[PDB]
Amino acid sequence: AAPIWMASPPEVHSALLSNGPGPGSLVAAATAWSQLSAEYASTAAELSGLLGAVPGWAWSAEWYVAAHLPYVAWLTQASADAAGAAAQHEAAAAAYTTALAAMPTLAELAANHVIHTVLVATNFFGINTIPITLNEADYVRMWLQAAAVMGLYQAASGAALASA
Amino acid sequence: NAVELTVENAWFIAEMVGAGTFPWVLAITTPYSDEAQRSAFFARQRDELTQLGLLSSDGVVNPAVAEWIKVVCFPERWLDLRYVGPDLLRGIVAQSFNTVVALRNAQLVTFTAMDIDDPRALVPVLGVGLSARPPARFEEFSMPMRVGARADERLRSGESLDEVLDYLGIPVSARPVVQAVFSGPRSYVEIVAGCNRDGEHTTTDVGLSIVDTTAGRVLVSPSRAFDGEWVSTFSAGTPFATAVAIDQLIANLPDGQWFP
Amino acid sequence: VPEGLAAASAAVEALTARLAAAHASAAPVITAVVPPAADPVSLQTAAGFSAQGVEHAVVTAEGVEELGRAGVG
């Protein structure tokens, strides 16, 4: 089901997303749909050039070639939505790589909390620099950045999946 | 006369009243992480709030409280609060005429309605999360901050405290009191003023801070210099010298201080 | 088989053969796409890309056989 990106801290959003096979599986299909689209088209021109293989007496039973040619329209509409799927996959892959580089790292979130504990330890002189606040404000920033990135990755990848 | 509740209770009120998102100093996030679990809590929260009476028969909320939430979610001039004492307590002081203050002790949000009586009416609420010590006395001195923040960065990286507090414009009468703040039984707070009179909202570059140590309460009021830098005075924790030390901080904001 | 249509018959056989070759070469990769991560978005889109991948791999599987059976008379 569709989740809520705000109830979950950035630590969990970055954990699921940071660790995985990678987008390499999507691009492996893009280059297979685009390879497939080129063969759906290449075979359409061979079909439309089916005549001429009838030597001389083209005459009699021309119904043979008359019945294979109509499928050249199906090969063009097949080559179309094939190269479209290659674009749908390549879009989601770029949606992932850009969302991963926009997600705050687990190590970043790690180094945030260690700074928050040592501020509690000794903070008297540099206390009008308000480090307690700016260290939490940096967390809520990462909180909202993680929630935003996922909300956008849901739509970016939700529209690449769309197929009328 | 006021009321307290939990973080999950608080957020549900923002959905019927429509105030929206709480200030993130309170860290009041949404309880559930899926609309599939929504009805479970839409029904469990309205069940718990009628037990306290603030939520009426079906969906009507207490007006004396529905006011206290709208002024907190979207205020006009606020004051972030962040208490520290060995466990953290944090809240906000909102104003919209009326003034409503909230505090969250990591699980319980407690709202309360106050007034704009005088500059002296704010020193209790900024000194209630502390340990409520009496004001100490010592020789006042003002040292640069961006260099003073470098001092605390050494202490936290393994440095001795008695051989550095002398490498300043430190007096002799104030070395005993600044030695008691780097101990166990001590508490402080950081105050950040904010205003929302624009398409955006703004806070202050720096903040006021009071410390209730063993030697006594200590005021730490900053002030702008000529070169854009910040210098902070270390004076006594006078409940009346703080009321002026804060309107100073509010003056840094384009909406100016609250009242003369 | 007719007389002069032998050349035409061998051609459509080379067409269905050329398709099935490139159709099965790219079949196990368009239908088996794994989510780049564990998050629920990657899981939902990797399932959909496999869904519309298998459906396309069987509809075009019938279409190739529908093409070979055009010369029935």
What is the per-residue DSSP string for C13-68? HHHHHHHHHHHHHSHHHHS----SSSSHHHHHHHHHHHHHHHHHHHHHHHHHHHHH
Dihedral over Cα of B247, B252, B257, B258: its sign: negative
* Spatial distance between the Cα atoms of C2 and B241, rounded to a whole number of angstroms: 111
Closest chain B residue to A144, measured at CA: B24
Q: Is B239 exposed, middle or buried (0-12, 13-18, 19+ CB in 10 A)?
A: middle
Q: How far is A157 from chain B (nearest CA, A)?
A: 19
What residues contact B114, with CB distance under 8 A and at least 6 apart?
A: B99, B100, B101, B121, B125
Residue of C nearest to A55 (CA): C4
Q: Where are the domains of chain B?
A: 1-260
Q: Which residues does chain B have within 8 Å of residue A137's beta carbon, measured at their own beta carbons? A: 24
What is the 3-state secondary structure of chain A? CCECCCCCCHHHHHHHHHCCCCCHHHHHHHHHHHHHHHHHHHHHHHHHCCCCCCCCCCCCCCHHHHHHCCHHHHHHHHHHHHHHHHHHHHHHHHHHHHHHCCCCCHHHHHHHHHHHHHHHHCCCHHHCCCHHHHHHHHHHHHHHHHHHHHHHHHHHHHHHCCCC
Is residue A136 a contact partner of residue A119, using CB atoms and an 8 Å limit?
no
Q: Report which residue type is found at B86.
A: P
Q: Is C69 helix (H, G, I), strand (E, B) or coil?
A: coil
3-state secondary structure chain B: CCEEEEHHHHHHHHHHHCCCCCCCCCCCCCCCCEHHHHHHHHHHHHHHHHHHCCECCCCCECHHHHHHHHHHHCCCEEEEEEEECCCEEEEEEEECCCEEEEEECCCEEEEEEECCCCHHHHCCCCCCCCCCCCECCCCCEEEEHHHHHHHHHHHCCCCCCCCCCCCCCCCCCCHHHHHHCCCCCCEEEEEEEEECCCCCCEECCCCEEEEECCCCEEEEEEEECCCCCEEEEEEECCCCHHHHHHHHHHHCCCCCCCCC
**Cβ–Cβ under 8 Å, residues A65 and C2:** no
What is the C-alpha separation between B91 and B75, in angstroms, rounded? 14
User: C13 is written with which tokens?
Assistant: 């056989």
* Pair type for strands B187-195 and B77-84: antiparallel
Inter-chain residue contact A6 with B30, CB threshold 8 Å:
yes
Question: How distant is the Cα of B149 from the closest Cα of chain A, in angstroms?
Answer: 4
What lies within 8 Å, CB to CB, of B138 at 6+ separation is: B171, B173, B174, B176, B177, B215, B236
Distance CA C20, CA A40 (A): 11
Q: How far apart are CA B144 and CA B121, in angstroms?
A: 30
- Of the candidates A96, A29, A153, A1, the residue with the CA atom closest to the CA atom of residue C49: A29
Nearest Cα of chain A lies from the Cα of B239 at a distance, in angstroms, of 19
- Chain C environment of A88 (Cβ under 8 Å): 49
Q: CA B46, B48, B53: angle at the middle one, nearest 5?
A: 90
Backbone angles phi, psi at A41, to 5 degrees: -80, -45
CA B177 – CA B216 distance, rounded (Å)? 8
Give just the sign of the alpha carbon dihedral A73, A78, A79, A81: positive
Cβ of A129 within 8 Å of Cβ of B145? The answer is yes
Measured between its terminal Cα atoms, the distance across chain A in Å is 22
Tally the residues of chain A: 164
A150: amino acid identity, one letter: M
Chain-chain contact of A128 with B88 (C-beta, under 8 angstroms):
no
Residue C41 and residue A158: Cβ atoms within 8 Å? yes
Instruction: Give CA torsion, residues A141, B232, B146, B143, to 10 deg.
Output: -160
CB contact under 8 A, B190 and A132: yes
CB A1 within 8 A of CB B35: yes
Decide if A4 touches B, using CB distance below 8 A: yes
Q: Which two tokens stand for residue B68?
A: 């206290």
Chain B interface residues facing chain A, Cβ-Cβ under 8 Å? 24-25, 27, 29-36, 80, 82, 84, 88, 143, 145-146, 148-153, 155-156, 178, 181-182, 188, 190, 192, 206-209, 211, 220, 222, 230, 232
Cβ atoms of residues B122 and B246 within 8 Å? yes
Q: Which of A22, A39, A68 sits opposite C22 (nearest CB)?
A: A39
C26·A35 Cβ contact <8 A: yes
Phi, psi of B153 (to 5 degrees): -70, -25
Specify the DSSP class assigned to residue C3.
S
Rounded Cα gap, residues A17 and A96, in angstroms:
9
CA-CA distance, B239 to B242, in Å (whole number)?
A: 6
Strand partners, B189: B83, B210
* Min Cα–Cα distance to chain A from C54, Å: 12
**How many beta carbons lie within 10 A of that of residue B150, not counting itself?**
12
Q: Is A74 exposed, middle or buried (0-12, 13-18, 19+ CB in 10 A)?
A: middle
Tokens of B117: 């009586």
Cα–Cα dist B68/B25, whole Å? 17
Interface test with C, best of A36, A76, A98 (most C CBs within 10 A): A36
Q: Which of B21, B22, B24 to mutate to test the interface with A (most CBs of A within 10 A)?
A: B24
Residue B93, token pair as written in the block: 């002081």
Contact A19 C67 (CB under 8 A): no
Q: Torsion-angle region of residue B147: left (phi > 0), alpha (psi -120 to 50) or beta?
A: alpha
What's the CA gap between A40 and A49, in Å, rounded?
15
Q: How far apart are CA B130 and CA B80, in angstroms?
A: 15
Tell me the two tokens of residue B210.
């009071």
Neighbouring CB atoms inside 10 A of A112's CB total 18
Q: What single-letter amino acid sits at C12?
A: V
What's C12-27 look like in SS3? HHHHHHHHHHHHHHCH
To the nearest whole Å, the CA of B87 is away from the closest chain A CA by 10
The secondary structure element, H or E, covering residue C9 is helix C6-25
Check if the beta carbon of residue B202 is closer than 8 Å to that of residue B167. no
Distance CA A25, CA A4 (A): 27
Chains A, C: CB pairs < 8 Å: 137
CA nearest neighbour of B166 among B149, B143, B187, B135? B143
Subunits touching A (CB < 8 Å, at least 3 pairs)?
Answer: B, C
Tokens of C68: 């070979």
Query: CB under 8 Å to C22, separation ≥6 — which residues?
Result: A35, A36, A39
B6, B114 in Cβ contact below 8 A?
no
**Residue B129, CA distances (Å) to A93, A130, B87 in order:** 51, 17, 12
* Integer-rounded Cα radius of gyration of chain B: 21
Burial of A4 per CB tally in 10 Å (0-12, 13-18, 19+): middle
Which amino acid is located at A8 in the chain? S
- Phi-psi label, residue A52: left if phi above 0, alpha if psi -120 to 50, beta otherwise: left
Burial, B168: exposed, middle or buried (Cβ in 10 Å; 0-12, 13-18, 19+)?
middle
With CB atoms and an 8 Å threshold, state whether A157 touches C36. Answer: no
Q: What's the token pair of residue A162? A: 């769309």
How many residue pairs bridge chain A and chain B with CB atoms within 8 Å of each other? 91
Which residues, including other chains, have CB under 8 Å from residue A144's CB and lie 6 or more apart?
Answer: none
> Which residue numbers come right before each break in chain A (C to N over 2.5 Å)?
59
- Joined together, the tokens standing for residue B225 give 């210099």
Experimental method: X-ray
Angle made by CA atoms A153, A155, A156, in degrees to the nearest 5: 60
- Which of B82, B146, B155 is facing A132, going by the closest CB pair? B82
Handedness of CA C61, C66, C67, C71 (dihedral sign): positive
Rounded CA-CA distance B127/A7 in Å is 32
Distance in Å, alpha carbon of A54 to nearest chain C alpha carbon: 6
